[PDB]
Amino acid sequence: ATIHVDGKEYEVNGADNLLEACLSLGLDIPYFCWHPALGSVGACRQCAVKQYQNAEDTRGRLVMSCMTPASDGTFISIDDEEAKQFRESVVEWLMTNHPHDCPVCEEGGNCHLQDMTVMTGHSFRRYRFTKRTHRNQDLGPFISHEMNRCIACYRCVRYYKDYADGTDLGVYGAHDNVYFGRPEDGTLESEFSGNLVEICPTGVFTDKTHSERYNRKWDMQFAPSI
Amino acid sequence: DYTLTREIVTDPLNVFMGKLNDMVNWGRKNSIWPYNFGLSCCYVEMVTSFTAVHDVARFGAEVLRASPRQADLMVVAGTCFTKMAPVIQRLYDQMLEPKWVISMGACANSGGMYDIYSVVQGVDKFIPVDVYIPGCPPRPEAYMQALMLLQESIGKERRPLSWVVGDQGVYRANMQSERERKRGERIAVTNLRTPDEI
Amino acid sequence: EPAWQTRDHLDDPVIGELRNRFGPDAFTVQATRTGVPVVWIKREQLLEVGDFLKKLPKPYVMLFDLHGMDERLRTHREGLPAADFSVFYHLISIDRNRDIMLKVALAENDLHVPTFTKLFPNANWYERETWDLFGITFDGHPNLRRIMMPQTWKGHPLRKDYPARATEFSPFELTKAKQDLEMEALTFKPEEWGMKRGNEDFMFLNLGPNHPSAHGAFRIVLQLDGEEIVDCVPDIGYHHRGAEKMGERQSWHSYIPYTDRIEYLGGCVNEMPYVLAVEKLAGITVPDRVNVIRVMLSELFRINSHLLYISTFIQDVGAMTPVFFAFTDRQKIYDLVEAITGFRMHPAWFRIGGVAHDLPRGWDRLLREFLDWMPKRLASYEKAALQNTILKGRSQGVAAYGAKEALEWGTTGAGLRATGIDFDVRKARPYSGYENFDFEIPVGGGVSDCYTRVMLKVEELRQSLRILEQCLNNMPEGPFKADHPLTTPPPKERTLQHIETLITHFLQVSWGPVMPANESFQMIEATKGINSYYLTSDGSTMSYRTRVRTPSFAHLQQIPAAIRGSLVSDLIVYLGSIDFVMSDVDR
Amino acid sequence: MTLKELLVGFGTQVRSIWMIGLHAFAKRETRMYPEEPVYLPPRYRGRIVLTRDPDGEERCVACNLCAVACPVGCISLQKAETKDGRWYPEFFRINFSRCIFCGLCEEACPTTAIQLTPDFEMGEYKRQDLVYEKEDLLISGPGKYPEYNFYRMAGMAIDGKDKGEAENEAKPIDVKSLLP
Numbered sequence A: 001a002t003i004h005v006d007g008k009e010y011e012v013n014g015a016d017n018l019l020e021a022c023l024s025l026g027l028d029i030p031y032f033c034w035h036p037a038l039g040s041v042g043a044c045r046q047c048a049v050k051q052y053q054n055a056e057d058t059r060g061r062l063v064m065s066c067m068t069p070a071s072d073g074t075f076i077s078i079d080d081e082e083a084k085q086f087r088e089s090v091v092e093w094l095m096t097n098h099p100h101d102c103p104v105c106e107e108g109g110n111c112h113l114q115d116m117t118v119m120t121g122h123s124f125r126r127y128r129f130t131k132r133t134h135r136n137q138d139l140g141p142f143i144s145h146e147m148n149r150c151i152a153c154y155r156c157v158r159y160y161k162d163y164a165d166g167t168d169l170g171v172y173g174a175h176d177n178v179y180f181g182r183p184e185d186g187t188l189e190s191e192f193s194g195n196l197v198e199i200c201p202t203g204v205f206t207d208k209t210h211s212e213r214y215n216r217k218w219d220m221q222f223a224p225s226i
Numbered sequence B: 001d002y003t004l005t006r007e008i009v010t011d012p013l014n015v016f017m018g019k020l021n022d023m024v025n026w027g028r029k030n031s032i033w034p035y036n037f038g039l040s041c042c043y044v045e046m047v048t049s050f051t052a053v054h055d056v057a058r059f060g061a062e063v064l065r066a067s068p069r070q071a072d073l074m075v076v077a078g079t080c081f082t083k084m085a086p087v088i089q090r091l092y093d094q095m096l097e098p099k100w101v102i103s104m105g106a107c108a109n110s111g112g113m114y115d116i117y118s119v120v121q122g123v124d125k126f127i128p129v130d131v132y133i134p135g136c137p138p139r140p141e142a143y144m145q146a147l148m149l150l151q152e153s154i155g156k157e158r159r160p161l162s163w164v165v166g167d168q169g170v171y172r173a174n175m176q177s178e179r180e181r182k183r184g185e186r187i188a189v190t191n192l193r194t195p196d197e198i
Numbered sequence C: 001e002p003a004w005q006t007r008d009h010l011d012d013p014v015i016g017e018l019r020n021r022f023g024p025d026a027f028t029v030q031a032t033r034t035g036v037p038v039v040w041i042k043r044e045q046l047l048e049v050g051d052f053l054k055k056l057p058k059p060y061v062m063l064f065d066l067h068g069m070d071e072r073l074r075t076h077r078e079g080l081p082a083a084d085f086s087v088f089y090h091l092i093s094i095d096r097n098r099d100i101m102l103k104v105a106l107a108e109n110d111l112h113v114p115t116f117t118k119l120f121p122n123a124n125w126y127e128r129e130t131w132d133l134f135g136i137t138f139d140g141h142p143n144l145r146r147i148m149m150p151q152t153w154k155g156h157p158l159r160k161d162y163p164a165r166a167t168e169f170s171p172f173e174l175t176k177a178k179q180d181l182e183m184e185a186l187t188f189k190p191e192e193w194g195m196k197r198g199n200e201d202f203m204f205l206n207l208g209p210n211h212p213s214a215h216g217a218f219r220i221v222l223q224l225d226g227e228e229i230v231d232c233v234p235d236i237g238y239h240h241r242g243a244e245k246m247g248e249r250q251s252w253h254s255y256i257p258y259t260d261r262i263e264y265l266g267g268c269v270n271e272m273p274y275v276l277a278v279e280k281l282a283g284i285t286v287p288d289r290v291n292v293i294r295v296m297l298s299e300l301f302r303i304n305s306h307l308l309y310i311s312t313f314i315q316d317v318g319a320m321t322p323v324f325f326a327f328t329d330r331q332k333i334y335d336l337v338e339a340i341t342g343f344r345m346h347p348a349w350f351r352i353g354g355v356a357h358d359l360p361r362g363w364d365r366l367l368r369e370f371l372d373w374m375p376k377r378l379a380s381y382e383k384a385a386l387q388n389t390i391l392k393g394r395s396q397g398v399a400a401y402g403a404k405e406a407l408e409w410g411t412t413g414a415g416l417r418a419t420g421i422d423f424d425v426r427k428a429r430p431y432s433g434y435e436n437f438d439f440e441i442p443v444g445g446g447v448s449d450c451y452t453r454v455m456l457k458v459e460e461l462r463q464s465l466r467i468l469e470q471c472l473n474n475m476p477e478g479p480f481k482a483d484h485p486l487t488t489p490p491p492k493e494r495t496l497q498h499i500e501t502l503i504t505h506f507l508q509v510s511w512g513p514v515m516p517a518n519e520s521f522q523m524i525e526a527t528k529g530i531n532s533y534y535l536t537s538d539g540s541t542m543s544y545r546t547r548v549r550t551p552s553f554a555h556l557q558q559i560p561a562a563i564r565g566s567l568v569s570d571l572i573v574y575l576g577s578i579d580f581v582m583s584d585v586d587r
Numbered sequence D: 001m002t003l004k005e006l007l008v009g010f011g012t013q014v015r016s017i018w019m020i021g022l023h024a025f026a027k028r029e030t031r032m033y034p035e036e037p038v039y040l041p042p043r044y045r046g047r048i049v050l051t052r053d054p055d056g057e058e059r060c061v062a063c064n065l066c067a068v069a070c071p072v073g074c075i076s077l078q079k080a081e082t083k084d085g086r087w088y089p090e091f092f093r094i095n096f097s098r099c100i101f102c103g104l105c106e107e108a109c110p111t112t113a114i115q116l117t118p119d120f121e122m123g124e125y126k127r128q129d130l131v132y133e134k135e136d137l138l139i140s141g142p143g144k145y146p147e148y149n150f151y152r153m154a155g156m157a158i159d160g161k162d163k164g165e166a167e168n169e170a171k172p173i174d175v176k177s178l179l180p
């Protein structure tokens, strides 16, 4: 397939969507709800790019790159001004309820939400009202729960239920009061519940064993082991 | 408590020999002659201390000899570069007993910010050091405070009065650190001026 | 169009001239944010291109810079030739008020370039440093030796595979180097140093590693006929701190304290071109209050450095009194700088997009007191020392040169303008809002003597006092930091209460700010000459290459060409009249 | 030399004699250290301390931003936690033989705990005693920032501050609430 991103021609796979095709080419599009192992559901509305009907088109429309296929002869723009403003607006809406928690959060320096906040160029807050609060649950000795940091990207429920076939983690409530977790306090019953600490782009589900003796990612000595 | 250089050995100090050692120590602290050695920024603050606004001369340390044989104190004020370290060692070996060392600034203390291929990580790697000043650079009054610290360390050290009699080893007192000495008044600090004013 | 935008400079006349001369297929134009045309030239056409530029109607007459780049790890080289290494030649045309950067691509195995010393004599030390730090061999060089490291050094430290950290200290190599130092005089031969006919009449005298003055500690070996210096080669590298390797080793924000200590009498002056180049890389246009604050700090530090230079020159001639009062004036300057930035000599106060804090309440009172203090002390020092006959006799007519010698050796600052060339960076290529200040550029008659350079620095002192008066009287009200997302750090109160600003601060102080992959350049008029930063970014949070061009390197290279045939005392007053520091030379 | 040059030289030397004598008849500009204490501005970058909140607890939350913002790498700390959930440093050590007193750690603190204070008198006899630990840095008050409390800003629950008790935070609404 042939796509044109910002006037540059690329050869992609027509069976992929535009987000995974453009991320495979090294282009940077912010995203939250899409995962390579989970698929595209179009929740966070963050991966917006401007699609044009043909080469001689100037108007276009904002579409989700994760929901739009990477078909042949597809003209899109990532660095368009309207798309950039919309992505910064999505980060701004996610920043309205987010707690002032980065120093005391175990995802600091390892946070996908921090990365996409910086990448969108959003560093000014014109929101002056209150932020919603949630009480935490006890998820057992491995996963620490902090629901204030959630951005409702639905990755945890999608992985835990649709991928890992777990039953004890879900989504409750409606509007901006959506809550993610167990119906009551107790240990997460899945054998693959620890992948939530990397599935969650925020610091909601965190490693409690690492949180006991915590240090940031830049302070680690890593090795490739088995 | 003292330590020996020819181990930890107690204080040996007849009263006339004690008064003679006291007056030798007094004359040695009240007349300390630094060596005019320049390495880097910290030497600029050293010669700042020698000038009129600060007036090191009140301590009797303005004589500032240009030959190491005539100097009592070596102030390593700057970075110990790899090429300059043999020069520093030769200059220190040209000195005569007694000779003390004041390390000025982070570079001469530990290498400072310059953990780099061409810098020796501290002047204490190859020559013994008596006083250390943190700073980059230390202000001239910090160098003055180190001069008084060296005076205190000098005034209760034991050296032979002559080579014809007595013990010929040197005794340097294990001084109480300034950190644990000043911890009583440093922790009691409660409020400081806000940085928005002059 | 903003001044930091990526441009290829194809409308510049030199590109069309090169196209009409060598053909369109002979070179490649690279679009950067350096502000100069960057042309990739083939290696076998380098001498022809350089001579063609030297023979232009308004020719490129000065080699500003010459160094290398290790391009093995550069992941973003789109539109660039295939190169394991590269060598860049920055040439400046004063008549055109223009400059051009030529780049020669090199493979790993074939790491040799033709020498540039036949066109520009400062290529000697520049290519010596390029060979020392990158291992690039220049064919036809008279003496290609290591200039920063000792001759018994294994490896080239600016290569990407060299370890930046300090190696473990061992007393064995220290003792070996001490034995070599003691045996250096008896085992001396002039053939390695580049001298000849050591005749049975000339003596060879070393000026000692340690030197008792604020200029630093370095060695110069002299070939003498009686008391006349017939040849000399300066031995430098004793003050090498690996600052460029630290630029590759530190983030964009954390390298500012290392920018401070490049020339330690400059402070904010050395801070200025680095933060301007990073703001070019970031696409940051700083507001006017930031510009006026930076200009005020730069002029305060310029006055400090010039006061030190004049006082040290007066002391080196033989009058030791006025350096004390000059240091009292420097203490007044230090009082103001302490109040504003919190430190005396290395403030580390300029930020990417602004300054670390706002101006404290009471800065204007201290500035007014200092501005009332300065002129009477300046007149007192001038009448007490600078108009006295003995210092004039010791300084006038010593190590003079014309405009051609300054141009061919890359001499900048007070010497170049003493030769009658009115080239100041603050006027020719304005930066930091220097076009909104009413000040003059003092010049000379055509001969750059010691006394002429000293009086030019005195007139620069007076002009900087005028600029400081303009900064005091017209200080704009507004932000002390830019409104850009890449302002590092973000303003502190919004960091302390807004989550997105806390996120930006968290990711900028920890990993570092991400500068998109480009090349930027900034040239400023420093306290001792013309100081430039050349920054290559590969898209990461650290600099891929940090090249620092310092004027003191060029002046110490010009030293043997101007002192040849003079006396030893003439050499020491020439050393006192250059306004250099060894940290500026060796970096 | 010529007679005019000699007379001009003698005049300049006599003028220098008179000006140095008039400098002698002037007023001293020497600060009487240590008898006269050095005035330092409030933002002077001297000795580093760790400060407390107005409530009396230490302000540091062991977030390791100052350690990574240090260009020398002379800050070492480890995060411990109380039973109520409050982060704090288990230890905090600074190698003051390495520190360049540049204030990037104070610039990087999101709680304004680490602070460079106007104090320079820090000379030491042994280099091992230039490694200040938490017992040598933590002071009894807030220092240069007298009112800022990070945990009032944060949404994490600690002792004496539950969910919805932070500033600009609403009370938590349960998903089981009857309101639409």
Ligand code: SF4
Residues within 6 Å of the ligand: A098, A099, A100, A101, A102, A105, A106, A107, A108, A109, A111, A112, A113, A114, A149, A201, A202, A203, A204, C503
């Ligand atoms: S989840 Fe991310 S943005 Fe939220 S407090 Fe933690 S590090 Fe900060």
Ligand code: SF4
Residues within 6 Å of the ligand: A149, A150, A151, A152, A153, A154, A155, A156, A157, A180, A199, A200, A201, A202, A204, A205
């Ligand atoms: S808890 Fe994490 S993974 Fe789940 S929706 Fe919220 S931000 Fe996404």
Ligand code: SF4
Residues within 6 Å of the ligand: B040, B041, B042, B077, B078, B079, B104, B105, B106, B107, B108, B112, B135, B136, B137, B138, C261, C264, D100
């Ligand atoms: S400690 Fe700082 S001021 Fe002193 S020599 Fe080193 S870089 Fe210069």
Ligand code: SF4
Residues within 6 Å of the ligand: D069, D070, D071, D072, D073, D074, D075, D094, D098, D099, D100, D101, D102, D103, D104, D105, D106
């Ligand atoms: S002042 Fe600078 S060198 Fe010292 S601990 Fe803080 S960041 Fe590190």
Ligand code: SF4
Residues within 6 Å of the ligand: A103, D059, D060, D061, D062, D063, D064, D065, D066, D067, D077, D105, D108, D109, D110, D111, D112, D113, D114
């Ligand atoms: S930046 Fe402040 S809160 Fe964070 S670890 Fe350092 S002193 Fe503690």
Ligand code: FES
Residues within 6 Å of the ligand: A019, A030, A031, A032, A033, A034, A041, A042, A043, A044, A045, A046, A047, A064, A065, A066, A067
């Ligand atoms: S990644 Fe496409 S909407 Fe979430």
